[PDB]
Amino acid sequence: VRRELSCEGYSIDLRCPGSDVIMIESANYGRTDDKICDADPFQMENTDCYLPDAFKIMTQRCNNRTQCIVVTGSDVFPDPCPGTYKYLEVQYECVP
Amino acid sequence: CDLSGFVRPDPVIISSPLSTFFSDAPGRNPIVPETQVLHEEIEVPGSSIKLIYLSSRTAGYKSLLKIIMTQSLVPLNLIKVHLMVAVEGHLFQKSFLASPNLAYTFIWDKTDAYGQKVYGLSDAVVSVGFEYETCPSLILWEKRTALLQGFELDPSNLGGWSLDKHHVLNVKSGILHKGNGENQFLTQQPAVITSIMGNGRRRSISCPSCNGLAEGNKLLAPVALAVGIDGSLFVGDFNYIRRIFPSRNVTSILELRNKEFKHSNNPAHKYYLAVDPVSGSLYVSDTNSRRIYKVKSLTGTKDLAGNSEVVAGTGEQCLPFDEARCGDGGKAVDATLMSPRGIAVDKYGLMYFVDATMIRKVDQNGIISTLLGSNDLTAVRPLSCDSSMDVSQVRLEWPTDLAVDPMDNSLYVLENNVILRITENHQVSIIAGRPMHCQVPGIDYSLSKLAIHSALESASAIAISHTGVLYISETDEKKINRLRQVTTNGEICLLAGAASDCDCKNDVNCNCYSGDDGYATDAILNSPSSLAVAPDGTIYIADLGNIRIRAVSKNRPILNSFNQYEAASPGEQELYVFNADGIHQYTLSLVTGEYLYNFTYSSDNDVTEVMDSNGNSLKVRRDASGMPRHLLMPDNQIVTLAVGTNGGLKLVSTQTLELGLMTYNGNSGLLATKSDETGWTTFYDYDHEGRLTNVTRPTGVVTSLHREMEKSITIDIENSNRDDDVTVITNLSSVEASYTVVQDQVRNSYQLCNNGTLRVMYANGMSISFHSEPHVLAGTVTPTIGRCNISLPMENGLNSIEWRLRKEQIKGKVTVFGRKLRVHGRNLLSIDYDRNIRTEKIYDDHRKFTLRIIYDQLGRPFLWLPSSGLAAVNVSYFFNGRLAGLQRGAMSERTDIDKQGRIISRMFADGKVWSYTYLEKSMVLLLQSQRQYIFEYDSSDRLHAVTMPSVARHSMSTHTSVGYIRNIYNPPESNASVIFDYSDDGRILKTSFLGTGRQVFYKYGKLSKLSEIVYDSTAVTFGYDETTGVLKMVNLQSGGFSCTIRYRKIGPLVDKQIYRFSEEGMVNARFDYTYHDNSFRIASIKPIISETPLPVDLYRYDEISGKVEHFGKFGVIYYDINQIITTAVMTLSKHFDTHGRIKEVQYEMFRSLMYWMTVQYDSMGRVTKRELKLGPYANTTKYTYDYDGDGQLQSVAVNDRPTWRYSYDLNGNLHLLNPGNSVRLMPLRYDLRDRITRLGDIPYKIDDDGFLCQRGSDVFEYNSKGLLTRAYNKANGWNVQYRYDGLGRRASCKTNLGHHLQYFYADLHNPTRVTHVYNHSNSEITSLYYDLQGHLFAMESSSGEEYYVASDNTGTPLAVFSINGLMIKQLQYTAYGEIYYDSNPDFQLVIGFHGGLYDPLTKLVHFTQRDYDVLAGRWTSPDYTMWKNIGREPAPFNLYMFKSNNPLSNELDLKNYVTDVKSWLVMFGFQLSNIIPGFPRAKMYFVSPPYELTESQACENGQLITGVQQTTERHNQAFMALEGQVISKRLHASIREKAGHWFATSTPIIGKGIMFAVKKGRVTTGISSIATDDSRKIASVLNSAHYLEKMHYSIEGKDTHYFVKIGSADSDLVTLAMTSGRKVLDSGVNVTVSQPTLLINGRTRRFTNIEFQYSTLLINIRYGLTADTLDEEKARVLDQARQRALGSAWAKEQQKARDGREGSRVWTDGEKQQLLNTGRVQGYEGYYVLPVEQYPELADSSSNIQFLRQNE
Lengths: 96, 1752
Ligand SMILES: *[C@@H]1O[C@H](CO)[C@@H](O[C@@H]2O[C@H](CO)[C@@H](O[C@@H]3O[C@H](CO[C@H]4O[C@H](CO)[C@@H](O)[C@H](O[C@H]5O[C@H](CO)[C@@H](O)[C@H](O)[C@@H]5O)[C@@H]4O)[C@@H](O)[C@H](O[C@H]4O[C@H](CO)[C@@H](O)[C@H](O)[C@@H]4O[C@H]4O[C@H](CO)[C@@H](O)[C@H](O)[C@@H]4O[C@H]4O[C@H](CO)[C@@H](O)[C@H](O)[C@@H]4O)[C@@H]3O)[C@H](O)[C@H]2NC(C)=O)[C@H](O)[C@H]1NC(C)=O
Ligand SMILES: *[C@@H]1O[C@H](CO)[C@@H](O[C@@H]2O[C@H](CO)[C@@H](O)[C@H](O)[C@H]2NC(C)=O)[C@H](O)[C@H]1NC(C)=O
Ligand SMILES: *[C@@H]1O[C@H](CO)[C@@H](O[C@@H]2O[C@H](CO)[C@@H](O)[C@H](O)[C@H]2NC(C)=O)[C@H](O)[C@H]1NC(C)=O
Ligand SMILES: *[C@@H]1O[C@H](CO)[C@@H](O[C@@H]2O[C@H](CO)[C@@H](O)[C@H](O)[C@H]2NC(C)=O)[C@H](O)[C@H]1NC(C)=O
Ligand SMILES: *[C@@H]1O[C@H](CO)[C@@H](O)[C@H](O)[C@H]1NC(C)=O
Description:
Chain A: Residues 6-95 form the SUEL-type lectin domain. The complex is a heterodimer of chains A (96) and B (1752). By secondary structure, chain A is mostly beta strands. Chain A contains 1 helix and 5 strands; from the N terminus they run βββαββ. In chain A, strands 1-5-3 form a 3-stranded antiparallel β-sheet. Chains A and B meet through β1 of A and β65 and β92 of B. The complex binds a molecule of 8 linked components (NAG-NAG-BMA-MAN-MAN-MAN-MAN-MAN), a molecule of 2 linked components (NAG-NAG) (3 copies) and 2-acetamido-2-deoxy-beta-D-glucopyranose. A molecule of 8 linked components (NAG-NAG-BMA-MAN-MAN-MAN-MAN-MAN) is lined by residues 1301, 1319, 1321-1322, 1326, 1368, 1383-1384, 1386-1388, 1390 of chain B.
């Protein structure tokens, strides 16, 4: 298992060695912790912000690829909690 | 007489700067240049608390006031100039005659008119008068104010000295006087803005509940302000006039019936207030009612509407052209007013007011008149820009506010954005503002700090303080809403009100109210209408737009609910608590909140006990009068204190040691002399002003400080021994204190601004701006650097670092203190401390790093809990808080202490125990193997001798010499001395090896940086840029050969590196570097070797951690602490265990495993098992390692079968081994000095310096620098020559067998790392690639070939794989690095054992500073620098043994126990050095680099000579601090360390209490009270002598210094009480008087000779009468040195012929035979290579001699 995390507006970079390809294990766009991605008091107001389609979006964009770049924002993901400063948290593997 | 248009006096007043500067290390540098202050210290045993002396905390340190009253041009009619100075009741008066550039400097003794001491800060009133020839009776006067520093408070009362941790607060002046010498003038910090009345909401017109507390009390419209004689603030709150009492309570005193709620913000209904200073009467003037009123009762009666009485006006508005002149000449009550505006009341009680366009008077009798008489348009002349005209010539257009100057008694008028002054003599002049008369091009130079040259933008109000300071309110009502200050000198600056981005009147979504309870310059005001100055100097603002009254106050500590004062030091992370009298109660941690120090006093408030957090109490035992007797240390040790009759601390001593001996200059308190236990006496000289002028040392070195006090204060710093002249220029203004540090043409600028900003503009081009903010915990009283904006001279050179502080309060008490580090709006790290659970959480913003540090009940960190399942680190402490033990999983190291606090035992987790026994200054260290080391010490804990288990005794000594401190190490039973000569500042000057005569000379230039290195016939020069001061060139010159390294820099960063050679065949190199935008990160490296461009290597990083994500063609992946290096072809996986040690390496190529290694360790971290598979189909080999009782490698087994055996001497010398692959056991032999003599049957030869000389037939030639220049074997027919650069790195390798390689160092972070190799036989370049641990893993050729290297745990290459994944080379090494198997010997590998450069001919592995012998298993030379710290840290040691005879494991150090945040971060791949500019990079060196190499990297860092440079460094270091508290990771006792003193001090010739100075080769001596009679005899003889500069030599082991005296020895012979022979003094010093006869170049000469000698130090004096005496002695000493150089060179040449070794010159069979029989060769003579005329220090050097015939 490999881990990547990026705050809102920043890209997440996934890379596999040689000919190995990405396989998405888990993904979430939102907020599950009060300490991750520091901002105004309004950031820590919601630790139960989940996007069910985050796994589907990451799977479609990154699976079977040597590398993947995804921006943590409104251009790629819907908003599961407007007003709360979000982040994209992903767990993945490199398979043949 | 009438003086109109006459030149007014414009004096320039310069006050002596405040003592704000102190030293970071008073023991290293006691001189504070800017304030000419001496900052000294005395370290006491048993405590970390020091005794501090600051020369500014004395009576002798006077206050200065330079008054320049006249310039180069003098007015025509001027005849006399008068001066008046008023300070604390004193009145100095002096008359002078008119002269160009006339100036006087006033000296204040810091006393009042009653002769009593004045403490804190005082105000001086300077009056300058101009008497003209036209009128001798009248004098034109001008009053100006200046700030003078008074007496500083003495907290500790220890004879002028203070306790390091003991502070005091001056409550009246607002000054924090710290015991360490730090002074914090709190009132000089940024001004604070607060709301004293109003809440931003309007009250009802009826004023219900208006009589209560001022704070938060609703206002309607504050249009006028006036301060009463009581200190009360009268508020013109539109409808009502409300009085704010000093008790902070409000009561309505007068109601105005003509005011309606609708007209609140109407300018027509605006009225003006004024307080009469005579009687506290309040005058009201309403423009709308056309009258002036006086408040009857200031307490407020029942009927408030009728509490006023008419002073002037009837109520009717009179026409502009009135016949009766609106009632002028008669009673004011009966008169009529046009429109009364601003009112001001004179000192005499005279009332002045603005009436439409004129100024009218109302005298004591009640008669109205006109001061500025209008309607006289004919006599009116337009406003003169320079000259001052009478009231009659002045016309006023739209005048508003009016105020009296309480210092001048002059009237100030605010008229159409121009402030004018009406003097008592009725003279009018422009004070502030630029009229249209001389707008453009009135001033060609444009911008200046003067008020006359600065235009006023919509001014509304004016106020004048008692110090004559004018405050101007400016309101545009849109964006301009500010308060400006005009000082007595005429300078204008912003005091309050930042430029608002938003429109206050037009924009609806706007908030023009901010900055309250913060700094004034940052605050945003809204429509300021009126101003008033409080008695304490605070400025009140009628902030009409925000319906509030705001106060701009001096930054001061406020009395809390507990009747206590609080101040803090964020840099030291401390909070100081003082009582109501400013007496130091406690010192708490600013982070932890735990008590660090508790102070208890006597009945007379004299400090008697300092109790630390650990329970260590330092008691001050005192007399009934408060006089100190002694100090009772925490270990119950008595430190005797003797205070002299002058009140100065005379003696500080223990029962054995004399820690300090001092003498003072009379009753001034100025420290004259200071002596220690060694007898080293420092002499201090001051001027009559008490400013430090000279510092003389026993070395003869004098540091001089010269002050030139003009418009700018310049301090010149000079040294008698160096050409490093430093000059500091100080320019003090209203906005900032400007400093310029000049070294030749290299200028560094420093700016300390009033807003709290510190700006540095380095000569290199880089600028740093530190910005202050009030502390989140301590408040406005302590400004903190929370922002740092960096600028580099490049395209995208703007960088920004930020510290965001926060707090969590539960029930009014601090629970959590958070700190977040940010770079360009991104959080990198957060350090939060939770006081409730005592944990310090350090965490990343992306779940990558998490560390928790647990603190005990005493507030000490004891447990480090890391993430990723890593082994936790825990520590033990003794009762006194000293570190007892350390533990990291299974690894532990504990100690036991004495009742005296000395380590008696050392326990390891494997059961190993070391015992420490103390017996009469000697310590015996015994190991369980019964190996014994005896360390003999001084009273000062400095080594005298070291006895090894072999019973061989090594001896050491240190002595003060002429211009330096000499450190001598003598090997067992040998005279072959190893000497390290250091300057007074601790810089290396000379390294000498007396055995063969090896010498390395270090010279320092004009920038106080390394300029030259001279050894043998080689000269290395360091060139610096004349303007930027950066290192531009490094050139090595050895005869014909020249090696030049040139640099180009972007600020302090290298962007270009050039390599140039003078040799025929040698190729040149160029490396171009680029940096990532808005960072200090290297983005690319572009090499060009032999004019052949190579591919660019790109570098990619993680912006949050600094982790290298991509380098060249390689990509890096990080997971926990493990790393993966990937390519489309290869994957290199590195796995680390819980202790951060490598456990598995995996090298895959084309998805196939090429190499894998597994390392296993014991409890102590020693390698016990290693499994290796070299190749995809090869078998796996298991290696098992066993260690002896001392952790020395005993045996190595291959697949559980014993193959190698190792045995050791009592000294740790490897005396038994199985060489290479052999089963045969070979013995090694050693002499008394631990030098190898035999390896089996092969004899070894090590010279008298400790360097490898021969191994059988192999001959090795090491230079003075310790570098192998040549190696050959005549029998085997091979020869190898090496070339080195100026930084001590190997540049080339050339053999007689065709081999020729060149080495290049392109890595700026790893300067000793070989990155490129040029091969001359095929002309191809090899690029070397290293992993994150520094091990070689890949290679790339310029031909297109790619190689993949398999390296072990030590960085040793074991296998090479081709571009097609095929193993082409496989190597097998023994534990000590000897190759026994090589599958392909033709494939030449540059890097060998332990990552060094291996040579297959010599069998040596090269590391930049040392060479390692693979056959013997030891180094080829000793590291003599080991002797410097072996005394402080005693342990088993050997000068030659490799890695403590454990070659496969990482060297055991206390750094293995991770107890600091920066070290934990490094493990996780984090590189803070890449994200935080200036942050120290973690050193990746096996062998320490040479002095010049480490110096070339650190020279770009800012210098620390001056006080402003040290202030800047404190700002930088405090900004880079991570943990709130750092532990002292030391399992050894603290030793008092002196600069350049390594060993036990020898009795000096220049005795204690004797002054010795050598200025321009001339000797001067002085005598103090403590000096003995025999020491005074030496001083008397040495006085007026001339020293032979650069002509001092080491002759027969003696440190000889030559001197000359012009005259007769008769006078000096009477002093010595001898005629001839040798005499022994009380000190033991030998005095030898003789009359030698010398034959120098055919000339015979006889003279008297007096010689002073103690041990190796020899001082020689020659007597003569002629002027040529100095020139004759110079010619004599050089001829005698030439004889020594020639004698030695011919002897060495004869020995080379005898040994069968190659000589310096090619001799024929006849020439060689002549040399063997006679010793000399006919026709041949020795000549100097480096000229003796430029290099007199190499006059006796045989290595600087070449044999040549007369043919040349
Ligand atoms: C600075 O620059 C210098 C150049 O100016 C440079 O010096 C040169 O370095 C290269 C590389 O090391 C040297 O080349 C080597 O020469 C070896 C010597 O072999 C000679 O002798 C044999 C008879 O005894 C001849 O058969 C052989 O002929 C071959 O080469 C001819 C070219 O001259 C060619 O015309 C022929 O057709 C024929 O092919 C030759 O005259 C040579 O053995 C060596 O080859 C091995 O190494 C290569 C990689 O370096 C491999 O690609 C290659 O396959 C070889 O590996 C095999 O041998 C190794 C050693 O025994 C084993 O470790 C390998 O596992 C492998 O063994 C297998 O294959 C064998 C058959 O191929 C078989 O017998 C085994 O059983 C096993 O199955 C290589 O070509 C060159 O001589 C140097 N040049 C000069 C002018 O000095 C210097 O190093 C540079 N310095 C630095 C610091 O960079
Ligand atoms: C680090 O913590 C360990 C506990 O994990 C300490 O080990 C204990 O030490 C005492 C002696 O003071 C022994 O009696 C116990 O048996 C040990 N506890 C156990 C069960 O592990 C250790 O002393 C600490 N290390 C240091 C040097 O402070
Ligand atoms: C170390 O001791 C040796 C021997 O005492 C010194 O060498 C002698 O020096 C004198 C004077 O220069 C010569 O006349 C002798 O011929 C030398 N003796 C021999 C045979 O070596 C040497 O100078 C001393 N060196 C130091 C560093 O003091
Ligand atoms: C003063 O001079 C005497 C005589 O030259 C020195 O004493 C000699 O020192 C050497 C070396 O320690 C001894 O081997 C001799 O036995 C001593 N000779 C005599 C005759 O006393 C003495 O060391 C000198 N003083 C100092 C402190 O350097
Ligand atoms: C100040 O005003 C309060 C009402 O707000 C009143 O209770 C108190 O007595 C007054 N205190 C003084 C200073 O007299």
